[PDB]
Design a protein around this motif. Sequence first.
Motif, PDB file in Angstrom:
ATOM      1  N   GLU A   1       7.892 -15.369  -6.278  1.00  0.00           N
ATOM      2  CA  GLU A   1       8.445 -14.130  -6.479  1.00  0.00           C
ATOM      3  C   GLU A   1       7.479 -13.628  -7.609  1.00  0.00           C
ATOM      4  N   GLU A   2       7.486 -14.065  -8.872  1.00  0.00           N
ATOM      5  CA  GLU A   2       6.810 -13.659  -9.915  1.00  0.00           C
ATOM      6  C   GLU A   2       5.379 -13.837  -9.909  1.00  0.00           C
ATOM      7  N   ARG A   3       4.762 -14.697  -8.718  1.00  0.00           N
ATOM      8  CA  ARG A   3       3.432 -14.594  -8.192  1.00  0.00           C
ATOM      9  C   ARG A   3       3.039 -13.297  -7.499  1.00  0.00           C
TER      10      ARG A   3
ATOM     11  N   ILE B   1       0.283 -11.395  -8.599  1.00  0.00           N
ATOM     12  CA  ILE B   1      -0.834 -11.145  -7.594  1.00  0.00           C
ATOM     13  C   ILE B   1      -0.510  -9.909  -6.841  1.00  0.00           C
ATOM     14  N   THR B   2      -0.163  -8.914  -7.389  1.00  0.00           N
ATOM     15  CA  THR B   2      -0.683  -7.766  -7.899  1.00  0.00           C
ATOM     16  C   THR B   2      -2.216  -7.875  -8.006  1.00  0.00           C
ATOM     17  N   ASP B   3      -2.953  -8.045  -8.790  1.00  0.00           N
ATOM     18  CA  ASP B   3      -4.556  -7.896  -8.931  1.00  0.00           C
ATOM     19  C   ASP B   3      -5.224  -7.842  -7.720  1.00  0.00           C
TER      20      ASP B   3
ATOM     21  N   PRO C   1      -5.167   2.954  -1.961  1.00  0.00           N
ATOM     22  CA  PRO C   1      -4.266   2.647  -2.938  1.00  0.00           C
ATOM     23  C   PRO C   1      -3.094   1.855  -2.794  1.00  0.00           C
ATOM     24  N   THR C   2      -2.935   0.792  -3.716  1.00  0.00           N
ATOM     25  CA  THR C   2      -1.635  -0.181  -3.601  1.00  0.00           C
ATOM     26  C   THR C   2      -0.518   0.737  -3.762  1.00  0.00           C
ATOM     27  N   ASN C   3       0.692   0.321  -3.176  1.00  0.00           N
ATOM     28  CA  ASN C   3       1.940   0.886  -3.359  1.00  0.00           C
ATOM     29  C   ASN C   3       2.209   0.651  -4.652  1.00  0.00           C
ATOM     30  N   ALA C   4       1.806  -0.371  -5.426  1.00  0.00           N
ATOM     31  CA  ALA C   4       2.085  -0.399  -6.824  1.00  0.00           C
ATOM     32  C   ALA C   4       1.188   0.582  -7.470  1.00  0.00           C
ATOM     33  N   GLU C   5      -0.099   0.708  -7.225  1.00  0.00           N
ATOM     34  CA  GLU C   5      -1.083   1.919  -7.823  1.00  0.00           C
ATOM     35  C   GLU C   5      -0.149   3.238  -7.708  1.00  0.00           C
ATOM     36  N   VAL C   6       0.252   3.466  -6.397  1.00  0.00           N
ATOM     37  CA  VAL C   6       0.935   4.786  -6.070  1.00  0.00           C
ATOM     38  C   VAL C   6       2.269   5.051  -6.758  1.00  0.00           C
ATOM     39  N   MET C   7       3.213   3.976  -6.757  1.00  0.00           N
ATOM     40  CA  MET C   7       4.425   3.943  -7.430  1.00  0.00           C
ATOM     41  C   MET C   7       4.519   4.151  -9.035  1.00  0.00           C
TER      42      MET C   7
ATOM     43  N   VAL D   1       3.798 -11.527   4.978  1.00  0.00           N
ATOM     44  CA  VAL D   1       5.196 -11.134   4.746  1.00  0.00           C
ATOM     45  C   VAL D   1       5.865 -11.757   3.554  1.00  0.00           C
ATOM     46  N   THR D   2       4.890 -12.763   2.837  1.00  0.00           N
ATOM     47  CA  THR D   2       5.647 -13.407   1.595  1.00  0.00           C
ATOM     48  C   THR D   2       5.112 -12.926   0.451  1.00  0.00           C
ATOM     49  N   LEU D   3       3.967 -12.228   0.171  1.00  0.00           N
ATOM     50  CA  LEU D   3       3.463 -11.840  -0.886  1.00  0.00           C
ATOM     51  C   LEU D   3       3.764 -10.401  -1.133  1.00  0.00           C
ATOM     52  N   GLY D   4       3.635 -10.169  -2.779  1.00  0.00           N
ATOM     53  CA  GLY D   4       3.794  -8.752  -3.244  1.00  0.00           C
ATOM     54  C   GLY D   4       4.404  -7.329  -2.413  1.00  0.00           C
ATOM     55  N   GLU D   5       3.397  -6.925  -1.544  1.00  0.00           N
ATOM     56  CA  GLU D   5       3.491  -5.963  -0.885  1.00  0.00           C
ATOM     57  C   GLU D   5       3.660  -6.231   0.712  1.00  0.00           C
ATOM     58  N   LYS D   6       5.061  -6.763   0.635  1.00  0.00           N
ATOM     59  CA  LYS D   6       5.408  -7.336   1.850  1.00  0.00           C
ATOM     60  C   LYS D   6       5.167  -6.577   3.371  1.00  0.00           C
ATOM     61  N   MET D   7       4.316  -7.143   4.083  1.00  0.00           N
ATOM     62  CA  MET D   7       3.937  -6.559   5.094  1.00  0.00           C
ATOM     63  C   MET D   7       5.222  -7.057   6.398  1.00  0.00           C
ATOM     64  N   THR D   8       5.423  -5.969   7.165  1.00  0.00           N
ATOM     65  CA  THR D   8       6.258  -6.223   8.194  1.00  0.00           C
ATOM     66  C   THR D   8       5.344  -7.226   9.248  1.00  0.00           C
TER      67      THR D   8
END
Lengths: 148, 196, 196, 98, 146, 49, 146
Positions: E55-57, E61-63, A40-46, A111-118
């Motif tokens: 940032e807004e991507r 990107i989400t989905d 479940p994405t952190n966004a889904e859980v949140m 690192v750079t996208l949405g659900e920023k990984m360490t």
Amino acid sequence: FSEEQTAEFKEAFQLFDRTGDGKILYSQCGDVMRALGQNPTNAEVMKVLGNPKSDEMNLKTLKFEQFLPMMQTIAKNKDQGCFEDYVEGLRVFDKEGNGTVMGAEIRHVLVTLGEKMTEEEVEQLVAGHEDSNGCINYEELVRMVLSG
Amino acid sequence: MGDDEKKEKKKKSKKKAEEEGGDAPAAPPAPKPPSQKRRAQRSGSNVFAMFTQHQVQEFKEAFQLIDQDKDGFISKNDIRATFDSLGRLCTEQELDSMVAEAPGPINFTMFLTIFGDRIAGTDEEDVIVNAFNLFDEGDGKCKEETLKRSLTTWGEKFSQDEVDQALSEAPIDGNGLIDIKKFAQILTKGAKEEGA
Amino acid sequence: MGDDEKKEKKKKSKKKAEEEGGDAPAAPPAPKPPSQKRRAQRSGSNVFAMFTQHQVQEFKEAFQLIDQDKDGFISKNDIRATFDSLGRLCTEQELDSMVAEAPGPINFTMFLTIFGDRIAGTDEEDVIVNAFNLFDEGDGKCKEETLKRSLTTWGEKFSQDEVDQALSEAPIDGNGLIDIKKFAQILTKGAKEEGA
Amino acid sequence: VLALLDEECWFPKATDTSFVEKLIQEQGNHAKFQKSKQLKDKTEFCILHYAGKVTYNASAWLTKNMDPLNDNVTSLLNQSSDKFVADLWKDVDRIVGL
Amino acid sequence: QRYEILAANAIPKGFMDGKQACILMIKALELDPNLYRIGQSKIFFRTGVLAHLEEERDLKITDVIIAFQAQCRGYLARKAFAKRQQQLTAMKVIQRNCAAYLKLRNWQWWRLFTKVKPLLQSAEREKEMASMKEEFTRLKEALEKS
Amino acid sequence: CAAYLKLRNWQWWRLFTKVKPLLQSAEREKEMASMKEEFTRLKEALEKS
Amino acid sequence: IAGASEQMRNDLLLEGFNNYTFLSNGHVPIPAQQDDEMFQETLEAMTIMGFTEEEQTSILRVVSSVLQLGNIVFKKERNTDQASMPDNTAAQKVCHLMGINVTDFTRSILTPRIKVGRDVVQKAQTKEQADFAIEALAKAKFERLF
């Protein structure tokens, strides 16, 4: 869920406690869920936690009939992907178009996208699926992420 | 019947645990129903195989200065003797707590399961070391003040008397009680001094 | 009450040492308020290999070898016909004295009562390697001239006879009595029979 | 006590522990009831009966309230053959017909 | 090969030219024509744009690429959950201990296994013997291909 | 050396072999001494590679 | 176990001192009484108001039936939860010495074959339910056999 697997979940709950009274930290919810056949994405859980920041994310508590409904309320699920989705979604480092993927960049997206990984999370998913030049065959990197 | 196995083990089980609820009184202790021998099996338990060549014969390597029954034993009448002459102890209250590692013949073929019961018996590492090693976070330890806050404010609340005695005693080692070692003082690999 | 435990502490004797050897003491513990007996520990069981793992195994289990008539004691006729069953017999006098290394009933316990307690005799083999291994100036050997000259001249002195006997037995090679082997030649898993 | 324990006897979430927790929960303040001398750990309750006070201990009580008189057996016992039983189980009335 | 799924709706049908599909993903979060720039390999952006749309991507990107990172987190948490899977009844055991602490440093089977325990051979060893034979072969194979 | 000349001679010392290697607790050790040396010779060379 | 002559130690199925499921604390002795001799005295009493020797080789296997009414207990079944009958011989001792049938007993003592409406309320009883109607009949063996 069947009582069987839910008993296994009862344990995966029971183990993870604090003051000794049926109390799991919000933080642990998705991770326990992840082991329980779910990603479940952190966004889904949140969503199903009610938007905490890091402070009350670390501080607020779950209990079992908050946890087990949450598990379920994601588990019966909407979009969750397959090989065809993830070969495109992992052609996602093709540099020219190459059937093999970018070594630093696979780390960076993580690192750079949405659900920023360490750094930690990034390196672990990626490492040793590249070659000498650091090209990763994604066609396989896909199946690796999709089963295991 | 098989209560014969259990008379030889009302001797030897009793080796676990019937009078164990000593100063904290008269607990629901070890049961007579035979399946429950395997709740007496809790974690912290290693027992080496019969013709061991030797992790079991190491008990012969000290045997001399312990035994009772020398065709080669330590009976009821030998932790209800020997611990009063070897490791610790017992009131009729704590009687077969410690004497519950022999209410019946520790034969050599039971020395086997007494250094077995050494690395086993009383809530051993997976319980004791991990009592706080699980409150702990990692390659770590637990904070002194927070452990004071525990002992008094968390659960069955204890007295001043209880804290002070367990304060002067607590291995406070860098603002933090060295929990792993407060328990495993009782364990590792460099001593042959007590218990046995 | 707090007493029935302490009643029981006396059957230790009834099959170990005491029924020969009050010599090897029952050590009085158990002062009635049973908080007390936590002072009675035997703290520190270590030295070089007391039960050496190719020796004391055998000794004890050579009770099951040396008890020939299978009574449970060791007679004058046990040690004898059991040595005869191997080979080299002691005379009844030599045997009588070797039994009289204990006061009479050398049974399963009296046997090991004198066996373990006797911790002294010859030097250890690794000390015996050090014997000439500390004389060498490098990793090398020992020049034969130096082993001959020394045994006769230096400190405690041999006779000619004493050297020549030791010399036909002495593995000379390359004018060098490579000492490490001669040491093993004298004292490894050595000869049987001579005691018990 | 009995009624909470009948219910608690028919209960999976229910521990001899939660029996005494349900007793503190329901009774508590009653001018004939009293808690343990802090021994929640042993799980016990001191009560004023007409002739004063007692402590009961609750470990393995749940089962001791249950006897769910199975009519399947009670009826085989009701219609029993031998010199032993046919007499003492003809009290068929109370038995679990539902 | 990043912005991809800003338009999960626009791209389907297995695989798809790189360059072009990027216009498809980029349009689906506004990414205004004058602000991003396409070469062969490099993309170029004006002041202000790249980066709030990167940032807004992250927001759009989400989905799938959040559901990519999710699968990762999954795969990893399986292995990495550890830290709190524990303390409960052992903490309550600290309380068992503590009611008896007065009698804790006060313990029966303490140290008498381990000083004459350098001097001995025959060790874990029966646990070893079977599994030692298994260990012997394996150790050979693994050294070989290194 | 003088003990070979003299002290090879009591009644309660030279009893070590004949029927005394028949008491066991040495078999698999003979193998797991030689195998033990190979065991580190296998472990170490692997790890270090 | 104490007045156990070797012959009937084999015949009456005697496991030894301590080698028992639930003779806990091994052999605890008793002040001023000696279990040994007390065997005979308590063998004697049953005769007066009148139990025969069939009944008493049976009350000898009523030692085996109070040892095995320490064993007709549906030991809490850790996995399924609804617990079941450890020993047939024990039920066999029991229902014959309650004048009913041994199979018909245990069947019901696991599955109540009851009947509400259409629904033949056939189901398992829990440990609490079943080892209650079989503690309520191991000890209404001990009670309706008192």
